[PDB]
Amino acid sequence: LTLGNTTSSVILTNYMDTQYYGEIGIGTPPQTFKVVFDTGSSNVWVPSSKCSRLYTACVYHKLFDASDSSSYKHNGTELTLRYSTGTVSGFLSQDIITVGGITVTQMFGEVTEMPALPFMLAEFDGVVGMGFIEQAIGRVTPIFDNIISQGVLKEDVFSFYYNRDSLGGQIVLGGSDPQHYEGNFHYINLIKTGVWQIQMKGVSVGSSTLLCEDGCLALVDTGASYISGSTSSIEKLMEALGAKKRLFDYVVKCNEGPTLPDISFHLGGKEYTLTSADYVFQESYSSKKLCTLAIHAMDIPPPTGPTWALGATFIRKFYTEFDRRNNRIGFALAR
Ligand SMILES: CC(C)CCNC(=O)[C@@H]1CNC[C@H](N2CC(=O)N(c3ccccc3Cl)CC2(C)C)C1
Ligand SMILES: *[C@@H]1O[C@H](CO)[C@@H](O)[C@H](O)[C@H]1NC(C)=O
Questions:
Q1: Is 224 exposed, middle or buried (0-12, 13-18, 19+ CB in 10 A)?
Q2: Nearest protein Cα to ligand 2, atom 8
Q3: Which residue puts its alpha carbon closest to atom 11 of ligand 2?
Q4: Are 311 and 226 in contact (CB under 8 A)?
Q5: What ranges do the domains of the chain cover?
Q6: Multiple choice CATH, 177-334, 2.130.10.10, 3.20.10.10, 2.40.70.10, 3.40.50.300
Q7: β-strands 197-200, 181-189 pairing
Q8: Residues with catalytic annotation?
Q9: Second CATH level (architecture) for the domain 7-176
Q10: CA of 221 relative to ligand 1 center, distance in Å
């Protein structure tokens, strides 16, 4: 584990408080792509120029063309990424990727099949998985494991900062930016290495800790826009907020938004509270209009689930650092 002295930062654009993306470049000359950095997965992929134009999502995004890259190295093994809300498919390729000033030869997937739903709703073109190889598909080495191999990063960690719509957000590779957090960092260890998940001692909504009273799992997901729990949990949680469930999310009468109780997550002894302003898309104060909440149900299957997921809703309030070296996660108040 060679630790050098370079600390890179990736500037992020905040789209609707639901998607945080930055730029990376693939090949020579660089072909730029807008991507999301997802601690929830470990592969890197962008749409391919070989993607049939019958996939409208491909027509609406930047396409990587191997024929315009002199640094390209063929491979072709098929790859399928099945995410919680959709799937992408294609084949593996290799070329040089530039992220935050760092140039690393990376193996990525050239997607030739990306469904209109949900990808048509994606501002970004691709995803850059920030997880461990244990979660990587096709056994492809994650892009961070490769940067750590170049022994240039001061520290074997990276930090995320999600702003709330100046810069939309920021990722620091090799450290954290003291500019975006105050107070001390409070860490927790991962249940097991290979996944960015930690034990969660309990969840309290309002005056009663009616949820996860006997402990539960908490996944810290930078690629997730909201916070999620088992359908069972969310129904309890939403029942308590007085919210009514729609097809894909929960809402409340906008006038009722500001009166919503606080919601806390007991992580590693420290209490992480969010007021209604932190999880309600207060777009109106009218009683005659619905306001959606940044929390919904999601039943992640084992070995990972059942489990909660703390996404942008949570990270917007707490600066998050991911420590690969000591397999822990640290939180601090974001400023
Ligand atoms: C391969 C394996 C690790 C699956 C488990 N991990 C996950 O499913 C990933 C867990 N973190 C969030 C990931 N995202 C889901 C999603 O809904 N996204 C999204 C957001 C807004 C608009 C459109 C889209 Cl597609 C972005 C991605 C990064 C795909 C999936
Ligand atoms: C693709 O990469 C894998 C991983 O090392 C390698 O074993 C395989 O031979 C490559 N495919 C080809 C034939 O280029």
A1: buried
A2: 75
A3: 75
A4: yes
A5: 7-176, 177-334
A6: 2.40.70.10
A7: unpaired
A8: 38, 221
A9: Beta Barrel (2.40)
A10: 9
Q: What is the DSSP string of 222-258?
A: TT-SSEEE-HHHHHHHHHHHT-EE-SSSEEEEGGGGG
Residue 202, token pair as written in the block: 């309990």
CB 284 within 8 A of CB 254: yes
Q: What is the DSSP string of 189-221?
A: EBSSTTS-EEEE-EEEETTEEEESTT-EEEEE-
Technique behind this structure? X-ray
What does this entry list as its resolution, in Å? Answer: 2.7
Which atom of ligand 1 sits closest to the CA of residue 223?
12
> Quick check: do 7-176 and 177-334 share a fold?
yes
Task: Give the DSSP H or E segment for 148.
Answer: helix 143-149
Residue nearest to atom 14 of ligand 2 (CA): 75
Closest CA to 16 of 101, 121, 157, 161: 121
CB 188 within 8 A of CB 218: no
